[PDB]
Design an enzyme around this catalytic site. Structure first.
Site, PDB file in Angstrom:
ATOM      1  N   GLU A  12       0.461  -1.167   0.172  1.00 52.07           N
ATOM      2  CA  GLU A  12       0.458  -0.094   0.106  1.00 52.07           C
ATOM      3  C   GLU A  12       0.794   1.407   0.203  1.00 52.07           C
ATOM      4  OE1 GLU A  12      -2.132  -1.317   4.024  1.00 52.07           O
ATOM      5  OE2 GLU A  12      -3.635  -1.256   2.491  1.00 52.07           O
ATOM      6  N   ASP A 123       8.688  11.107  -2.486  1.00 56.73           N
ATOM      7  CA  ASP A 123       8.804  10.026  -1.421  1.00 56.73           C
ATOM      8  C   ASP A 123       9.326   8.635  -1.488  1.00 56.73           C
ATOM      9  OD1 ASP A 123       7.024   9.480   0.673  1.00 56.73           O
ATOM     10  OD2 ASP A 123       5.224   8.418  -0.643  1.00 56.73           O
TER      11      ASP A 123
END
Ligand SMILES: COc1ccc(O)c(-c2nc(N)nc(N)n2)c1
Length: 294
Positions: A12, A123
């Site tokens: 995820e 990220d």
């Protein structure tokens, strides 16, 4: 989206879940990222589609970008294991230094490539670094923040990882640079070495203060302009910088100096991927084979 058979859910991400899937017709195994929802920025799918042209040995190949049912699917070549899983799997013995060095070198090559093509990740974390049985390591999910932006959490209420966020991001900078990826990579490098996250903040302020407690509270001397940043508060406690030999023992001086340059507060002073590749730490780099349990 039934061209596959979702072999299984494998992760995820901040921008969406990832699945392992096999193509019914071709039989190829790929990784499918589902991006969260009834509009999707105009230039977004366009910018992301441009990433399909990105080809580098250290960048996970983006095979397709499909827009259907108002949803966005990214089809990636499938690598067999993520660095987080490998790190946990190597927690008792640790990743051998030559392998850590190899991975850092390859990751810098991948970042040097993306940055030269004006592509930032923004990220980076162990979860989006993928490894294969041959000793290669690749970065996945570049340029997503530039095309979209950091949301509240994730597609379905998840605990976003703040541990690898550059200080300029935490201080509310509106414009970030490629320096943010070097910071994240520095944090990952430290973690591979010590087998513990460098700055495991549980909140944005805790993340910031963990950084300050270790590297010292930044000031105008080390970071011109820091006191005028959006979220900077003169009320921040003033912690003195800790001896750096405490940070990543028992990494050698070359590794420590390189790490210190990747963690400079001022984005302008922080070393680039290109300059880092020429650091003496890599004079003896090799390409070891990892022991992977798939
Ligand atoms: C774009 O995100 C990606 C792209 C390609 C990938 O192979 C993965 C991935 N692969 C494995 N084995 N585990 C995990 N957790 N993720 C993830």
């Amino acid at each position: 989206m039934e061209n596959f058979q979702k072999v299984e859910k494998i992760g995820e991400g901040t921008y969406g879940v990832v699945y392992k899937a096999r193509n019914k017709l071709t039989g190829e195994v790929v990784a499918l990222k589902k991006i969260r929802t009834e509009g999707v920025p105009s230039t977004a799918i366009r910018e992301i589609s441009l990433l399909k042209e990105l080809n580098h040995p250290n960048i996970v190949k983006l095979l397709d970008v499909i827009h259907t049912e108002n949803k966005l699917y990214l089809v990636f070549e499938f690598l067999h294991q993520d660095l987080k899983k490998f790190m946990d799997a190597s927690a008792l013995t640790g990743i051998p230094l030559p392998l850590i060095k190899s991975y850092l070198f390859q990751l810098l090559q991948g970042l040097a490539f993306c940055h030269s093509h004006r592509v930032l990740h923004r990220d980076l974390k162990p979860q989006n670094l993928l490894i294969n049985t041959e000793g290669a390591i690749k970065l996945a999910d570049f340029g997503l923040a530039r095309a979209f932006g950091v949301p509240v959490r994730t597609y379905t209420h998840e605990v976003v990882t703040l541990w690898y966020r550059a200080p300029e991001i935490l201080l509310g900078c509106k414009y970030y640079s490629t320096a943010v990826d070097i910071w994240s990579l520095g944090c990952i490098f430290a973690e591979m070495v010590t087998r513990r996250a460098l700055f495991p903040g549980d909140s944005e302020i805790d993340q910031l203060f963990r950084i300050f407690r270790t590297l010292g509270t930044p000031d105008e001397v080390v970071w011109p302009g820091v006191t005028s940043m959006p979220d900077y508060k003169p009320s921040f406690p003033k912690w003195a910088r800790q001896d750096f030999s405490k940070v990543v023992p028992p990494l050698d001086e070359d590794g420590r100096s390189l790490l210190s340059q990747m963690l400079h507060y001022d984005p302008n002073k922080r070393i680039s991927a290109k300059a880092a590749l020429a650091h003496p730490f890599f004079q003896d780099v090799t390409k070891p084979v990892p022991h992977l349990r798939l």
